[PDB]
Scaffold this active site. Structure first.
Site, PDB file in Angstrom:
ATOM      1  N   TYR A 137      35.351 -18.663  -2.348  1.00  0.00           N
ATOM      2  CA  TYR A 137      35.028 -17.249  -2.556  1.00  0.00           C
ATOM      3  C   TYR A 137      35.313 -16.453  -1.286  1.00  0.00           C
ATOM      4  O   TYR A 137      35.960 -15.401  -1.323  1.00  0.00           O
ATOM      5  CB  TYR A 137      33.552 -17.054  -2.942  1.00  0.00           C
ATOM      6  CG  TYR A 137      33.191 -15.585  -3.034  1.00  0.00           C
ATOM      7  CD1 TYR A 137      33.622 -14.818  -4.118  1.00  0.00           C
ATOM      8  CD2 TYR A 137      32.484 -14.947  -2.016  1.00  0.00           C
ATOM      9  CE1 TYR A 137      33.341 -13.465  -4.199  1.00  0.00           C
ATOM     10  CE2 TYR A 137      32.202 -13.582  -2.086  1.00  0.00           C
ATOM     11  CZ  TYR A 137      32.630 -12.855  -3.183  1.00  0.00           C
ATOM     12  OH  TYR A 137      32.382 -11.504  -3.252  1.00  0.00           O
ATOM     13  N   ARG A 194      23.519  -9.708  -7.741  1.00  0.00           N
ATOM     14  CA  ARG A 194      24.614 -10.555  -7.285  1.00  0.00           C
ATOM     15  C   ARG A 194      24.084 -11.755  -6.503  1.00  0.00           C
ATOM     16  O   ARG A 194      23.121 -11.637  -5.748  1.00  0.00           O
ATOM     17  CB  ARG A 194      25.573  -9.742  -6.417  1.00  0.00           C
ATOM     18  CG  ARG A 194      26.013  -8.430  -7.044  1.00  0.00           C
ATOM     19  CD  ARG A 194      27.230  -8.608  -7.943  1.00  0.00           C
ATOM     20  NE  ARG A 194      28.461  -8.682  -7.159  1.00  0.00           N
ATOM     21  CZ  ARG A 194      29.072  -7.635  -6.609  1.00  0.00           C
ATOM     22  NH1 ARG A 194      28.582  -6.407  -6.755  1.00  0.00           N
ATOM     23  NH2 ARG A 194      30.186  -7.815  -5.913  1.00  0.00           N
TER      24      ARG A 194
HETATM   25 CA   LIG Z   1      33.192  -6.817  -2.836  1.00  0.00          CA
END
Ligand SMILES: [Ca+2]
Ligand code: NI
Length: 335
Positions: A137, A194
């Site tokens: 990521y 998130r």
């Molecule tokens: Ca972002």
């Protein structure tokens, strides 16, 4: 001087990068406009990724094809509700200037945008599981920025070919910054729905990542925090190697400033309950001082080593990572 369109680009750079715009504006020759434009296109792309008001169905086509919009003179996006949405609403002004860059710079920027958009889309629906997935990521959203910048520096010939060629080191520059941000932003990310901390790590402490915001879990939360900071510290040797190879002063300052701010942030966060239950401060006369000083390798080493020394002597013996934290800091200094 500047065309009307490029004036606008520098206005947007100042709006979006604030204090750091001056560092970009100080870049020598052809690098200045190339990095300004790269930064603005990256800002546009990130604004799309981050905008939770844009459905996944609408968002993925934009991420997948973002690199193509660079070559579509009238492409814009008018529906963002995010901070930097002006770069999307006036994307034609940015893409016009992108298409005025030398082909060698266009190639780098388009390639990075392509690869980043694909990786960003891959992570929209999923959480980060393994530490390897955390690295992946971070590669997609930040390592590739380091790689892209490095390729710009080498293409411009203000830096040696090695800088662009050594993708592992350039990727590490990005990972250090991105892991530091993810660590610092636990609460704002959790509250925004998130989750970026790797499950492989947090699940050794709590049943759900959001449990770290529960006061009864604060000791566990801080242990996990310390484990992740220990992970991030492993990139420092590569950061030092990378910075040590730069021969252009303007490039050096541009690359070193964010890294010094990152190590300062990690030192502020280390063993700090405020990550979970309050507001971490980095004293801001300190931020300007680090910027001012980070202009040669001995100075940057001095800053990095002092923050590591402060962390080192703060490490509790009882921390489950205490041994690895001491070891990585000791190892880096021994180098
Ligand atoms: Ca972002
Ligand atoms: Ni010591």
């Amino acid at each position: 001087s500047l065309s009307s369109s490029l004036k606008t680009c520098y206005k947007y750079l100042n709006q979006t990068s604030r204090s750091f715009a001056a560092v970009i504006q100080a870049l020598d020759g052809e690098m200045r406009n190339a990095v300004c434009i790269f930064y603005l296109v990256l800002r546009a792309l990130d604004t799309l990724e981050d905008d939770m008001t844009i459905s996944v169905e609408k968002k993925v086509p934009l991420l997948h094809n973002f690199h193509s919009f660079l070559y579509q003179p009238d492409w814009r996006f008018m529906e963002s509700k995010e901070k930097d949405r002006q770069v999307l609403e006036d994307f034609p002004t940015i893409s016009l200037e992108f298409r005025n860059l030398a082909e060698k710079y266009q190639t780098v920027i388009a390639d990075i945008c392509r690869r980043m958009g694909i990786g960003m889309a891959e992570f929209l629906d999923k959480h980060v599981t393994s530490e390897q997935e955390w690295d992946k990521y971070c590669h997609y959203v930040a390592g590739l920025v380091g790689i892209g910048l490095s390729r710009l520096f080498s293409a411009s010939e203000f830096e040696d070919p090695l800088v662009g060629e050594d993708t592992e080191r350039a990727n590490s520059m990005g990972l250090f910054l991105q892991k530091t941000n993810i660590i610092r932003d636990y609460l704002e990310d959790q509250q925004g729905g998130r989750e970026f901390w790797p499950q492989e790590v947090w699940s050794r402490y709590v049943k759900k990542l959001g449990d770290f915001a529960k006061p009864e879990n604060i000791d566990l939360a801080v242990q996990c925090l310390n484990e992740l900071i220990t992970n991030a510290l492993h990139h420092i040797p590569d950061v030092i190697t990378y910075l040590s190879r730069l021969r252009n002063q303007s490039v050096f300052n541009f690359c070193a400033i964010p890294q010094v701010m990152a190590i300062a942030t990690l030192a502020a966060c280390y063993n700090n309950q405020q990550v979970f239950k309050g507001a971490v401060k980095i004293r801001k006369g300190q931020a300007v001082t680090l910027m001012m000083d980070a202009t040669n390798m001995p100075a940057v080493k001095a800053i990095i080593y002092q923050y590591m020394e402060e962390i080192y002597h703060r490490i509790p013996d009882s921390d489950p990572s205490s041994s690895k934290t001491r070891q990585i800091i000791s190892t880096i200094r021994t180098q």
